[model samples]
Target: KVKFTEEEDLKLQQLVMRYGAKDWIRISQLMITRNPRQCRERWNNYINPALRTDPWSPEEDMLLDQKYAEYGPKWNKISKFLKNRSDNNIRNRWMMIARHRAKHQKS
Candidate 1:
């Protein structure tokens, strides 16, 4: 196990505040162990299941498009505005939407 410094703890606290308590716990567990692979696995298996849902709602897509236009890829800030969403979820949804849009763009 890796030891976290005070600075790291502060950073973690900020992430917690931004992402919500569940994400904070998941991220902290991944961070403290110093294993990126494990972190990704935990995120995929645990965090993703809890957070992932249907395609973004029309209202959510509108919000995301507006935020992306205004802030240009500031997913964390966008997630902050979108309650119950994490930056990772925002990015994943964006990618999924982008792919779907691309596939249907010319149809």
Candidate 2:
């Protein structure tokens, strides 16, 4: 429940710098304060290291479609299929899909 301050950002960035990237278990253990998933989020979303933050590929889109059919917007569950995407990521991705579809259909 801690607000991620700019200090934490720098702290984490330096943590990744010192400890190397993609080492989540070690990173979380070293931090010893933040939630594992939240730390993972900060690393991926903000620090943008180790994890792939690129746009979803075709396979991911298909997974999103199928998982949506099965889970009906359970973004957290859907996100489990993705290594880098968060629940927030899934929600945003699907929303973007809807937005693009809407814009095109309107056109």
Candidate 3:
């Protein structure tokens, strides 16, 4: 398993904040020692029983959209309306949805 550093995690947090965070192909050049897929997988919605990483869930996505519409991005308030998710996780999810939407519109 790859041990992650808080510094790297913070860098990644600030990263996906951008619109679609751009294409994965470009991110490869930014952070060494970690790849784009490694960073993206950090947002999975549920913890895998054995793999130890949380996997994204459709149920979780629906709740995030529903709850977020009601609460906006006040992750503090939003966190109360959900589970297995951090404010950070919500941000990740939001950015992912942004990425997907952008890609789909053009394709």
Q: Which has the greatest lDDT?
A: 2
Report, for every candidate in turn, its global Cα lDDT versus the true structure: 0.63, 0.69, 0.58
Candidate 1 per-residue lDDT, tens place, 23-70, comes to 545675656556544444434433444555665688888767778899
Off by over 4 Å in 2: 1-5, 12-53
Please tell me which model should have the higher lDDT, number 2 or number 3: 2
Query: What value of lDDT does candidate 2 attain over all alpha carbons?
Result: 0.69
Name the weakest run of 10 consecutive residues (lDDT summed) in model 1: 37-46
Off by over 4 Å in 1: 1-50, 104-107
Ranking by lDDT: 2, 1, 3
Candidates sorted on TM-score, descending: 2, 1, 3
Put down candidate 2 lDDT per residue, 1-107, tens digits, no spaces.
76668877788877777776667667777666777667767766655623345668887776677878987777767666776676655676678877775675433
Provide the global lDDT of candidate 3 against the true structure: 0.58
Evaluation by lDDT, superior candidate among 1 and 3: 1
Model 3, which residues run further than 4 Å from truth?
1-52, 101-103
